[PDB]
Amino acid sequence: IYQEFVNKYSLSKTLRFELIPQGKTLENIKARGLILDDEKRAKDYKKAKQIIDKYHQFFIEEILSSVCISEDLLQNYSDVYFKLKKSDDDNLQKDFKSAKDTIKKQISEYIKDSEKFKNLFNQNLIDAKKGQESDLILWLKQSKDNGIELFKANSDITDIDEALEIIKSFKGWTTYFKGFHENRKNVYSSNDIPTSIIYRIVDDNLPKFLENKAKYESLKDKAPEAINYEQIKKDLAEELTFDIDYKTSEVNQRVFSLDEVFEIANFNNYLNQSGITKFNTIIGGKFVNGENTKRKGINEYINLYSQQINDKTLKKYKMSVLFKQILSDTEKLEDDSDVVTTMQSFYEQIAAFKTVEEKSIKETLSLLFDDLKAQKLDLSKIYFKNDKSLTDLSQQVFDDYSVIGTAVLEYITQQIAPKNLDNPSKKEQELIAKKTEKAKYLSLETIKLALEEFNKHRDIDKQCRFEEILANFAAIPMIFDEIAQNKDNLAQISIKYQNQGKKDLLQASAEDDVKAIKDLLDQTNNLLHKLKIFHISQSEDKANILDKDEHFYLVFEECYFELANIVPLYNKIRNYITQKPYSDEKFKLNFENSTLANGWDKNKEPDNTAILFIKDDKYYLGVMNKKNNKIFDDKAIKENKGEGYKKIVYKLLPGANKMLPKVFFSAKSIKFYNPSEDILRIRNHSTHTKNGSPQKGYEKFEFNIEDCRKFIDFYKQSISKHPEWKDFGFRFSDTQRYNSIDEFYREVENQGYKLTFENISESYIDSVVNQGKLYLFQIYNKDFSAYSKGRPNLHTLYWKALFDERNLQDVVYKLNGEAELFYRKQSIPKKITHPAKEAIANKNKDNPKKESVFEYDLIKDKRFTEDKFFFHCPITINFKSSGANKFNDEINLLLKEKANDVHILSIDRGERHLAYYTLVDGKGNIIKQDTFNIIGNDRMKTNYHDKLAAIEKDRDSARKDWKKINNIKEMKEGYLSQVVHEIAKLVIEYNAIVVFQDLNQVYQKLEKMLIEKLNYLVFKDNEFDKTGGVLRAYQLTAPFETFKKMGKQTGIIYYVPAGFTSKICPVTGFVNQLYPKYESVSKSQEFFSKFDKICYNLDKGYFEFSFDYKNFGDKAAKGKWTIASFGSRLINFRNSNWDTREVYPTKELEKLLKDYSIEYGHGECIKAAICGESDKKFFAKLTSVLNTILQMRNSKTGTELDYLISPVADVNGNFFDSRQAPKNMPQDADANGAYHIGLKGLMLLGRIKNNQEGKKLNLVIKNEEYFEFVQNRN
RNA sequence: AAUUUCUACUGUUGUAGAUGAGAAGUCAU
DNA sequence: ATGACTTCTCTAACGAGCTCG
DNA sequence: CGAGCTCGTTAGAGAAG
């Protein structure tokens, strides 16, 4: 049970709303320029960061290159890594810490004491102080306007002279940058973070630079290669000027060599980005636009050394690639003109695209398509590939299914011809061990050798040979004339889409015009489908030449090589019409205020300028204007103490590490608080802390419990003297029972939150709104109306419990600050598409109602058709008792008293069902069992595989007229969200824990949506502030960190290994790990000799193969089987007509062993009759029998009929077909695919109810443990 | 086809569920 | 071209700096 | 020039598979 598992840790939601402009606020908002003069700010703030991160680049350009030389200590780090990468010892894993925290401090002390660093993260960046010049404009004007570096030209901003007009226009706005001057302290950081530029060099360039020099001098062994220092260094000459030197001393102008490279003392050259562009250039190889190919590189000599030997081990000493530096850069057609201008420019390349013979596409290619029609030329210069592309010939001209496509394989796979069988069933789970290269190729002479034998199989001599199709291009020049005739009809849609910044072609008004270009995309659409019939892919078997000539394939690449832009264009404007209309920017409203609502707090209300209100459960926002911002001071509230709205007194104490030593020990009020001798002594040297900083100008001494618990005693003598903070009613614990400073601030910030209500009369608000000294908005969604028949959302079941009375008894929902306001521009013209009162037809066919009346109108989507405000407002749930470390471990200690009580869930994947839960109790007897297609079971009961069953057939829409709007691209993710609720209502109600598939696409995004969707879980129609309510409710899972470190247990969703659950009988537990494969005739006979007795059931009427696995070596498991030949089993085949051909077990044997000299009706061992039999035709159709004597899952044309059968009997002597099963066994081919996860997981409650005193107990399953366990619940 | 936004709906100027937001950062099925 | 995954804050009050007093 | 004075810093605790 989970009834004691409430109130565990702190979250950070973001309740979002829409703001309704009430009174006449939006008259005033458009009266002054606060939206027109917005989004030239808030779309240049987001364009300011190409005038600051074009300065963080140029800063790192001169803090790591010329300077910051961590010289010769790299040899100290070289020694602590090569010896460490074999051995994990305390002699060196803590000396791994040595040059870890030495090189960074050798760097970061040069970072934090540098030239431009100090005046970078304050006001001195943009505009500093009166008379002085700030660093950025000093950089931009006095270094970059004078020294003209034309690098603003490579962006959307025109020049530097306009760029300065942005920078001056942020004067006064430099606390609107507390989200962007947060992500630059963590670029020059020095910490355990994966973000910095110092983590980049010290932890992910240097430890992958030691691997580069260790495998460079090993490459100097067996090195005869013509590396460019042996022949020519003019190639990498200007690229390797190298006016510095970090080996001995800097030389003016000499060019380095390969001796300088990979030196441990020359890594100081290879630190920043300007130099990873020279490390990974000598390794990489530069391009030259002087009619040159790619010049020679180091790993282009490991290919030039392989001209002498073809070693697989030759490539293992190549050069890797170091990463790119943080924030440096090298130096989705959503434009409506580019849909027409691309093909309009692409249409112009036909007359300008010429061949190699000095003629045009028509001036030379016209007569070339009418000369070799007799096939007199060498038509054997072709090379195909027999993987997927071979079916286009017979599927294009023969119109067959499994006849012409199966006549190339047997002649090609029998090259070396080591083989006897096929059809590999497992296949689980590995790719390769060392290497494997064999054995086949692709060409056209095998088509002459495999189809030419069938060319003479007809009666008459006018059949289909391999050479009777050479005249397919008799009008190759005239075929382009059809696309040219469809070019004159483009000026209308080009006139209809003449606007650039509109995106006004994929609207509903251009619905009929979409056939003007989608049907216009048919003249070049199908030709590209046939355009791949003149060039094979790179399916070469290590000798990809194929005898390429230049006679027949001379002018093909000169004209047809330019035809790939239709694949670029038609493959580029697919999602342009597919995409739904959103077309916004969703930009932050400021209301002319760098701090719009950082915090809703009373002493700083005239600078956040944002107030909330309450009137009869309709929640309000109030944004004051800045010029009138003291209009709710203490004066104008004592006057207007009337009745009307309510008003919010949100009083806050944030950062008790940052606050209580801010007021008590600073220059304004230290004398009134009067610190003593002993108490200021402690805070001088940080004596009350374990890692706390001292006052700067001291040194960190020891922690003392005596010099900490007396320092907590100071704080009970200065908060009470603070003029306001005495009113919180702090009630601390006794200072004998405070352990340190961490267990004291858990009783400051868990009480520094007071929320009271002081009434404001309505008539006072209406005056200042109409005058303009407020902006009153309304907090609104579906759940705030009188048209609320039933259940609310969660983002309104929360907001109605921020301001609640029962919230403020003891706070479990703390309003946070930091919030913003957003304004979305409109993108949809309102066209109604459902007029008044008429009959409207449904779309759910599971409905006891077929029509709809609807007096009013219903527009397509009323969201985007209205210019709406938006308000995002964070909270912090379980604010007073946060923490919950070791939360995987804490829920496991919950279970130990709770044995014999908690039932177990289970969830598959699939596409036959989509999931299949099964509530397994402690003893395998399942309680519930239901699918997840019919879900949403209130009374509507919609169905979900059936909706996919046409969107499984989605690959038809965008092909003809380029019109695909059918929602695969979001429905995938969205089905799972309904499931999340429905998993969860079972979890709590059945005292249930959850298992899953471990996964050691939307194939893990369900499991994503049960971690962060059981952070905190709340049932809407549960009793308020009762055991699972909205205040006190269920937190069961620790949050999501990664999918990788998700681990075996991320809460109560355990995991079991994915393999061997879907082929198992429930009552006994067989798996066919034995793989009958038929290598050869006698090479199967030793398998049949290993059986116990292949007798017959004269008493029953079916064969049986008694067997034990241990006489074969794999090894699977241990037990006397006696498998049988009972149930009717189905076999699929090549569908296209042939998808089901049912084969009986016993009838197929009695046809076959009776056909040979084997008599069997007596009923004893028939070993030596089979073992003595030695026919080619016998065993090939006998191992295939036992292949399908054990194929326990059977479809019919799966789906719609996919039941369960099972060979093996039991102690009852009974088999198991699913149609004669009771309820407490599985039912389908995914229900047995889920029930074993539902008892592989049951021993994860077998371990945890019996966990050691040693509290480590891993949750990994070895396969033999399960394979024994399931067989032995009996 | 109505939404704080997304999917699915008629569940009737909405019902049932879902929900963490901004701005950066590297990098890969 | 989407999914990965590492990081910030989720903020009141003091105090340098300011326009004048 | 002490009031004022509006906007930017600045006070800096703590578990670790």
Swiss-Prot record:
Residues 654-753 are annotated as: PAM-interacting domain (PI). Cleavage of dsDNA requires Mg(2+). Another report shows DNA cleavage occurs equally well in the presence of Ca(2+) or Mg(2+). Processing of pre-crRNA requires a divalent cation, preferably Mg(2+) which is bound by the crRNA. Residues 963-1057 are annotated as: RuvC-II. The record marks K604 as: Binds DNA protospacer adjacent motif (PAM). The keyword RNA-binding applies. Residues 583-653 are annotated as: Wedge region 2. Residues 945-962 are annotated as: Bridge helix. This class of CRISPR enzymes recognize a 5' T-rich protospacer adjacent motif (PAM, TTN for this specific enzyme), unlike Cas9 enzymes which recognize 3' G-rich PAMs, thus this enzyme increases the possibilites for genome editing. The simplicity of the Cas12a-crRNA directed DNA endonuclease activity has been used to target and modify DNA sequences in rice and tobacco. Its EC number is 3.1.21.1, 4.6.1.22. Residues 299-303 are annotated as: Binds DNA in crRNA-target DNA heteroduplex. One of its GO terms (biological process) is defense response to virus. The record marks K129 as: Binds target strand DNA. It comes from Francisella tularensis subsp. novicida (strain U112). Residues 754-883 are annotated as: Wedge region 3. Might be a homodimer. Might be a monomer. It comes from the Bacteria. The active site is at H834 (for pre-crrna processing), K843 (for pre-crrna processing), K860 (for pre-crrna processing), D908 (for dnase activity of ruvc domain), Q997 (for dnase activity of ruvc domain), D1230 (for dnase activity of ruvc domain). Residues 45-49, 180-184 are annotated as: Binds crRNA alone and in crRNA-target DNA heteroduplex. This is CRISPR-associated endonuclease Cas12a. The record marks T293 as: Binds crRNA in crRNA-target DNA heteroduplex.
